[PDB]
């Protein structure tokens, strides 16, 4: 009842930029740079794979299998005997050989990397189990540094405490602080979304961004509590009528001229300057696109990259995804002639 | 079409956090009060016009007084209606018992220190208090003390109301008895609001 | 899989299977919406009844509208029964007892 919003910005705290809509706008954000979207999401996905317990019971049974190597309940041996020859061609023979090398390749995987629970790649064994209690899992998460991935875990680089070295207090600490600031800002964004979902004013007044300026009257506060109760929150008269908003927007978008442009001598519309197989057949050209031109050309040049068995990490630059896979294949093909 | 389930674990992790003092860049080292200025400005700018009293000169003063009276009375009515619930009275009683025991702890520590520093079980422990009517275990001394504090605070209300309303034929002649009556009725209404609380 | 290999999906079946403003506009322009009913104290939401020729049969879908001044002209010119309702003038008196409740 005590919340009142600014009447100029309607509780937003930001107005559309006076110029350009620049040196009067805000200072953009970290996620407007489209060139770093896939790198940012790749690092975030790599961080989230530590916490992800979607495959939890499967990795738990794998952990039990590698702990006690004395299992039972087989009850039928799989037949599964057809890796026919190193000869012939096609896709079936290649896929079948790659499927039949599964046991030796899994042994290689378990020798090079081992179980994720034995190397702290995942969260470990049963630490966070649902249906236990909200608070036992909180205690287990607060135990050691289970809330952080090992790339930001302080108990991994303390052995390098002498002279700093690889910047365990300047690079790992900076990365951990940036990660914590990002998750705290995510919580702030979620609180703002929750307040916006129920028509309430947002609690966190964020700085203006690259298309916005601060409000003239608030400066960015956009609302506040007061002794006087809101008579719009009371009596339900908080939101305008749809027809009234339509009439306001129609009158605002349709200015009229009450002077004929012959008595006043005006021959041009308002503004400065005054006197003066594309874009009409196909229509424009994308502007945010253009950094993916090389990847599109390479995907057209090599149709084998469209194979369903191939899954590149993703990216647009020379470093990452299609170009990385093509460079790896070319390096392998060049170095197999010398070996 | 799928059938949903009630989420009961870790439902809104962002709700039970106080991120405000971190987001607004406090502790490292926006402003309100456009609200009341805009409210009183709108009151003055529209004022509803008392054409039935042929648009008197004061007018804006009357509308501002009505707004302040309505706000004060709405807050006090909300508080009285909240404490009129018996479970809310149970809650108040529990908090008062806890504050009494904790005040005893504070008093013990403080006066023991300022005693040695001079010139340098449930029966007794919250059952016979939680189960008794609090009219019984409360001295009339604290009621008299609170009433004396209240009556000392709100003692200059008639004179201050007269000084505000009388500040910057019939002009100040049909006003002074009415403002006198309003000041007297307002003071008695504040005393009776304490009485009903 | 397909249902389990997005890693970004959030209520993909609850969002969708639900008319938005652009989808309502497309359905009206295709002559698939039988009736539009404005409801609410602000009349900013409609309960669109689609025809039997619509994709998905005849169903009622709630659409919240933006302040679009061409929507009523679109509905009228595409043969849609535009039913508003009541809209009592005295908003203060009408929205008083229900706010007390």
């Amino acid at each position: 009842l005590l919340q009142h919003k600014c009447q100029r910005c309607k509780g937003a705290g930001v107005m559309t930029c006076p110029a350009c809509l620049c040196r009067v706008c805000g200072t953009a954000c970290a996620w407007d740079a489209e060139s770093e979207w896939m790198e940012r999401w790749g690092e975030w996905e790599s961080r989230l794979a530590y916490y992800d317990k979607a495959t939890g019971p499967l990795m738990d049974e794998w952990y039990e299998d590698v702990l006690n190597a004395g299992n039972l309940e087989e009850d039928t041996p799989p037949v599964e005997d057809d890796p026919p020859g190193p000869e012939v061609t096609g896709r079936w023979a290649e896929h079948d050989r790659a499927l039949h090398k599964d046991k030796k390749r899994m042994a290689a995987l378990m020798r090079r990397w081992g179980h994720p629970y034995d190397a702290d790649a995942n969260l470990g064994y049963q630490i966070v189990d649902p249906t236990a209690s909200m608070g036992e899992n909180v205690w287990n998460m607060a135990q050691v540094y289970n809330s952080l991935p090992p790339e930001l875990n302080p108990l991994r680089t303390q052995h390098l405490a002498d002279r700093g070295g690889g910047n365990t207090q300047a690079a790992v600490e900076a990365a951990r602080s940036a990660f914590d600031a990002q998750v705290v800002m995510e919580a702030a964004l979620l609180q703002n979304l929750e307040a916006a979902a129920q028509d309430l004013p947002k609690p966190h007044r964020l700085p203006p961004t690259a298309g916005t300026v601060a409000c003239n009257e608030c400066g960015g506060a956009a609302w506040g509590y007061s002794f006087f109760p809101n008579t719009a929150v009371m009596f339900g008269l908080e939101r305008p009528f749809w027809g009234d908003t339509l009439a306001r927007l129609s009158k605002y978008w349709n200015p009229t001229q009450v002077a004929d442009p012959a008595r006043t001598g005006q021959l041009l519309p308002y503004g400065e300057g005054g006197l003066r197989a594309l874009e009409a057949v196909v229509g424009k050209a994308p502007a945010t696109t253009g950094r993916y031109r090389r990847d599109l050309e390479l995907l057209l040049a090599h149709p084998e990259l469209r194979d369903g068995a191939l899954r590149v990490p993703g990216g647009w630059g020379p470093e990452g995804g299609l170009q990385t896979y093509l460079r790896g294949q070319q390096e392998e093909q060049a170095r197999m002639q010398r070996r | 079409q799928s059938e949903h389930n009630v989420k009961i674990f870790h439902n809104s992790w962002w709700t039970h956090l106080n991120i405000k003092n971190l987001v607004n860049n406090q502790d490292m080292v926006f402003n309100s009060e456009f609200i009341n200025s805009a409210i009183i400005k709108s009151i003055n700018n529209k004022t509803l016009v008392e054409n039935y009293v042929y648009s008197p000169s004061s007018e804006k003063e009357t509308m501002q007084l009505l707004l302040m009276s309505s706000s004060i009375l709405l807050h006090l009515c909300a508080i009285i209606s909240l404490v009129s619930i018996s479970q809310v009275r149970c809650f108040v009683k529990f908090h008062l018992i806890l504050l009494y025991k904790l005040s005893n702890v504070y008093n013990a520590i403080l006066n023991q220190l300022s005693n040695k520093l001079q010139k340098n079980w449930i029966a007794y422990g919250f059952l016979v208090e939680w189960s008794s009517d609090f009219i019984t275990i409360i001295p009339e001394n604290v009621d008299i003390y609170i009433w004396n504090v209240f009556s000392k605070i709100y003692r200059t209300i008639p004179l201050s109301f007269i000084s505000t309303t009388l500040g910057p034929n019939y002009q100040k002649m049909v006003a002074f008895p009415i403002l006198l009556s309003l000041s007297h009725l307002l003071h008695r209404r504040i005393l009776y609001l304490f009485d009903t609380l | 899989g397909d249902a389990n290999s997005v890693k970004t999906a959030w209520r993909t079946q609850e969002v969708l299977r639900e008319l938005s403003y652009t989808q309502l506009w497309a359905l009206v322009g295709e002559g698939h919406v039988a009736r539009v009913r404005f409801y609410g104290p602000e009349k900013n939401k409609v309960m669109a009844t689609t025809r039997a020729s619509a994709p998905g049969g005849e169903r009622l879908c709630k659409v919240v509208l933006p302040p679009d001044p061409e929507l009523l002209d679109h509905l009228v010119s595409n043969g849609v029964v535009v039913d508003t309702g009541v809209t009592e003038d005295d908003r203060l008196r009408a929205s008083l007892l229900v706010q007390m409740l």
């Binding site: 109760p229 008579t231 719009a232 009371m234 009596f235 008269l237 | 409210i39 709108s42 009151i43 700018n45 529209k46 004022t47 509803l48 509308m63 009505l66 707004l67 309505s70 706000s71 709405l74 | 203060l92 008083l96």
Partner: peptide, 10 residues
């Protein structure tokens, strides 16, 4: 406040 509501809602 209902007497002041059309005034305040501006």
């Amino acid at each position: 406040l209902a007497l002041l509501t059309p005034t305040l809602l501006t």
